[PDB]
Design a binder for this molecule. Structure first.
Ligand SMILES: *[C@@H]1O[C@H](CO)[C@@H](O[C@@H]2O[C@H](CO)[C@@H](O)[C@H](O)[C@H]2NC(C)=O)[C@H](O)[C@H]1NC(C)=O
Ligand SMILES: *[C@@H]1O[C@H](CO)[C@@H](O[C@@H]2O[C@H](CO)[C@@H](O)[C@H](O)[C@H]2NC(C)=O)[C@H](O)[C@H]1NC(C)=O
Ligand SMILES: *[C@@H]1O[C@H](CO)[C@@H](O[C@@H]2O[C@H](CO)[C@@H](O)[C@H](O)[C@H]2NC(C)=O)[C@H](O)[C@H]1NC(C)=O
Ligand SMILES: *[C@@H]1O[C@H](CO)[C@@H](O[C@@H]2O[C@H](CO)[C@@H](O)[C@H](O)[C@H]2NC(C)=O)[C@H](O)[C@H]1NC(C)=O
Ligand SMILES: *[C@@H]1O[C@H](CO)[C@@H](O)[C@H](O)[C@H]1NC(C)=O
Ligand SMILES: *[C@@H]1O[C@H](CO)[C@@H](O)[C@H](O)[C@H]1NC(C)=O
Ligand SMILES: *[C@@H]1O[C@H](CO)[C@@H](O)[C@H](O)[C@H]1NC(C)=O
Ligand SMILES: *[C@@H]1O[C@H](CO)[C@@H](O)[C@H](O)[C@H]1NC(C)=O
Ligand SMILES: *[C@@H]1O[C@H](CO)[C@@H](O)[C@H](O)[C@H]1NC(C)=O
Ligand SMILES: *[C@@H]1O[C@H](CO)[C@@H](O)[C@H](O)[C@H]1NC(C)=O
Lengths: 459, 459
């Protein structure tokens, strides 16, 4: 209504402060989903053949099952984060079977639009897709990146990702010829478990080395595995910031030890971005009259803010002498011979600008906030029924706003189906209600409810 | 426009989240101003006579200058905090000479409306007025209290006073017959310097004793002297919380060692307010289906959240036995004899509620946040020109969002007019532009500009 619109201009100034009080909206969600269809594995095996023959030429020259985390993640988005405008899922050519494509708020974005060099679409590597979300048509300036296996809880709000006062919120964790032989080593670890999508520590070390070479030496931690808020403008600045470095990440059809991630690279560039000093900004903020001419009080506050306290009169006299020097080379003051101090006089006197730069050291271009792992759930699910049930009960007793469960099950064990059933039971317990993004389905499905009962009986 | 209104319902849920994303508005400002007119001092002296004669009967039975802080504070409100809707000034009967009463956004509220028992209006004591701001007609639910001597800076925003996630922001500082003889002592310290308005540590100790008696023993700090955000609902709850205790503060016509303040009392009640446990809330949050009946997963999460991890099967079996006990006294489960678990069954089984209370201990009714003195300026201005100029230069070099300058000048010294001139110079330097609340005035005033120059020459 018009009353609501006019209520925001009812302050003393009479202006509007929507951009400072009502948080940055809209905010979108981006998912990276993949499926283990027969065509995907066939492309995988031919790519293995190509890489093997490439290595063969190199030393000749020298001479599966997914327990539906996307469904429950979308349910979590609907339940705890109902302020999301649009949800995007990036896939090669696969469309989720149970997603309701008729819903305008969910869209499948193929790799054709995501990638710009159409010769890299059969990439089959998560960092390559991670490097190019911000180029999606219709994406908001600020969006959250979801890794298809992280869920929400405790009614998460955008206040937990970005704040207008302290900037973005950064969550950190534990601190971080012959090349053909190294490439020969990389062909052994291709099938570890990570082609299930969405070799890691080495890449982190490479990014640390690059940032160290450009931003200087600093002890760096790694971001937590949790839904990350990404700014399109900042990410694009990072893209042009290392043009050829991002090419290598997109060029590789295998996640290589030499590439840069989505969170470590984006966040630490945000924390280390240096903005050049603006002399005009200094003059404007010091000049409270906005008249362009400084009085004795403005000169005094300049001297205090340039020099170091305590301020002796010699500092102010020297600053005045420096100011009168420049005028000869190029509302009454105490010193009769001191000319009017305008922006041009202070921005053209080289030693004065040098002292200003000495006082105004390099600031940070973007604000940021740092927090620990008191609100992030990262649990390890490895083939042990007792450990899994204990961890899930720990989740249940104390909910956290960011929940991650790595599904690297052995898949060849007597206690794999039971663990899968327990995980499905936990996911359905957290979020039973079907989401709006799900096609009408799951009729008379009756997933195994006795395996959970079986481990209850065993324990 | 209608597009702006409809944009807030463009999320997945389709609802509106104005009350959670756009901060609590409107927010008002309340000033406590007083002037040293001849009538005020005449009432002061007759009150001194009454108190002296009261003490005389007691042991018979046994047998000035203000340097315009309100102007610059209003200028600071306009410059750095332009989001304030209304500004209120509470005075006995005095109206500031230079205030523009034609401005609808500034209003003078007399003590008649502030006080409810019309027999206490000649109170002449700051805590008495402090106890009754929240009863002002037209005041917002959340407002900032200004002590007529605290200014703003660095473009303060409501984010620095209250946050929707962490609640209100609390700023703390350094940790905290025969009665007729004590009353005889109190008559000596009546004129110290504090009848200039807007005996202090003893009152803090009294409030600490009251809170200790009611909220238990806890090490308590004192709030900083800075513009405090006060909630009308919380303050009213505190008013009814100690009905007769607040009477003594309002009854006294002298700020007595036995009374309770505006910040220490309000804040620590906010930090210690205990809300009784709601069993219905527990049942609702545990029941994710909202169907009113709990399944095996809901029972399991109840057991995990009531008992202590690790959860043995004996705990769950005991909880189930307890549940089936109550039904006899008053979607298939694993135990065939376990009746459907509704809200009534769990809220009527006494031992289950006892265990829930044991797990769900007493929570805090209101959220709060704690910060230090890294953004509050409290400087001491005592008759020393060098100390004053050093402190003011320290203010200038590093601005802070909350600036306080106590004007307890000796007023009988060779260096009092110089200090007053330096203070006026600093205030005009920070905020030269006249505010909208000032009547057109200050023509050809030409306040002394040579005393600052005089101390420049001396130094
Ligand atoms: C993921 O891939 C599976 C195959 O790996 C696909 O599921 C097939 O769906 C078709 C229907 O078009 C059935 O005829 C096949 O029997 C299914 N295969 C299997 C192994 O069940 C589908 O592309 C994706 N399925 C899901 C659930 O995401
Ligand atoms: C699965 O995890 C459980 C813990 O939940 C393991 O139980 C531990 O067993 C060792 C020795 O067998 C004991 O010293 C520990 O005290 C047990 N843990 C607890 C919490 O009591 C169990 O061994 C794990 N199973 C496998 C196959 O590793
Ligand atoms: C504060 O009190 C002073 C007196 O203590 C008042 O100023 C007087 O204003 C009248 C005009 O109505 C003059 O005729 C008097 O000469 C003033 N007195 C003095 C001592 O200057 C007034 O009530 C208040 N003044 C201010 C500036 O707030
Ligand atoms: C006013 O404050 C200044 C400090 O700004 C005092 O100067 C100090 O004087 C003592 C001895 O006289 C020295 O030991 C200190 O080093 C001085 N301070 C500084 C910062 O150098 C001055 O004494 C004060 N004046 C009065 C009357 O107390
Ligand atoms: C990227 O595209 C350019 C032409 O636009 C092409 O020359 C280059 O080889 C491509 N990169 C590849 C194929 O890795
Ligand atoms: C920063 O500098 C640019 C040009 O150097 C100027 O246009 C801009 O107004 C400055 N920003 C300020 C004064 O805030
Ligand atoms: C520049 O200023 C200094 C004082 O800081 C003065 O001694 C010197 O003579 C000035 N330069 C010229 C060319 O006058
Ligand atoms: C407050 O008002 C009541 C009546 O409303 C009166 O009895 C009482 O004496 C008053 N308190 C005083 C005068 O301190
Ligand atoms: C708290 O309890 C009251 C009654 O005891 C109930 O009306 C209210 O809905 C409860 N709050 C919840 C369930 O959030
Ligand atoms: C209550 O439950 C306990 C098991 O915890 C059981 O031993 C007892 O018999 C029950 N009470 C009655 C009256 O049956």
């Amino acid at each position: 209504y018009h009353v609501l619109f006019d209520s925001y201009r009812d302050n003393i100034a009479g202006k509007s402060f929507q951009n400072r009080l009502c948080l940055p909206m809209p905010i979108d969600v981006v998912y990276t989903w993949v499926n283990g269809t027969d065509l995907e594995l066939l492309k995988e095996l031919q790519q293995v053949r190509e890489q093997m023959e490439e290595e063969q030429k190199a030393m000749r020259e020298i001479l599966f099952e997914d327990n539906e985390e996307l469904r429950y993640s979308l349910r979590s988005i609907e339940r705890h984060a109902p302020w999301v405008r649009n949800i995007f899922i990036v896939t090669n050519g696969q469309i989720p079977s149970w997603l309701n494509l008729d819903n305008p708020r969910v869209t499948i974005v193929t790799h054709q639009d995501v990638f710009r060099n159409l010769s890299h679409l059969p990439t089959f590597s998560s960092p390559a897709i991670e490097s190019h979300i911000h180029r999606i048509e219709g994406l908001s300036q600020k969006f959250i990146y979801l890794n298809d296996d992280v869920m929400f809880g405790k009614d998460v709000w955008p206040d937990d990702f970005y704040s207008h006062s302290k900037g973005q919120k950064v969550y950190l964790t534990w601190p971080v010829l012959l090349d053909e032989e190294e490439s020969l080593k990389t062909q052994l670890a291709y099938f570890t478990d990570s082609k299930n999508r969405a070799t890691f520590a080495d890449s982190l070390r490479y990014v640390n080395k690059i940032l160290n070479s450009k931003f200087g030496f600093t002890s760096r931690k790694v971001p937590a595995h949790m839904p990350h808020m990404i700014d399109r403008i900042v990410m694009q600045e990072l893209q042009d910031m290392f043009p050829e470095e991002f090419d290598k990440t997109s060029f590789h059809k295998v996640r290589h030890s030499e590439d840069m991630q989505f969170a470590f690279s984006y966040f630490y560039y945000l924390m280390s971005a240096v903005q050049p000093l603006n002399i005009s900004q200094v003059f404007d903020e010091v000049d409270t009259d906005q008249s362009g001419v400084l009085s004795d009080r403005e000169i005094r506050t300049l001297a205090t803010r340039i020099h170091e306290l305590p301020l002796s009169l010699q500092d102010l006299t020297g600053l005045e002498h420096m100011l009168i020097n420049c005028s000869k080379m190029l509302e009454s003051y105490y010193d009769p011979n001191l000319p009017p101090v305008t922006k041009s006089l202070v921005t053209n006197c080289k030693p004065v600008t040098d002292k200003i730069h000495k006082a105004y050291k390099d600031k940070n271009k973007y604000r940021f906030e740092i927090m620990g792992e008191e609100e992030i759930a990262f649990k390890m699910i490895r083939t042990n029924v007792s450990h899994v049930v204990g961890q899930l009960d720990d989740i249940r007793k104390n909910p956290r706003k960011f929940v991650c469960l790595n599904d690297n099950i052995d898949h060849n064990h007597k206690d794999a189906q039971t663990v899968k059933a327990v995980l499905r039971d936990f996911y359905e317990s957290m979020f039973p209600i079907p989401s709006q993004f799900e096609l009408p389905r799951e009729y008379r499905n009756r997933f195994l409810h006795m395996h959970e009962l079986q481990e209850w009986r065993a324990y």
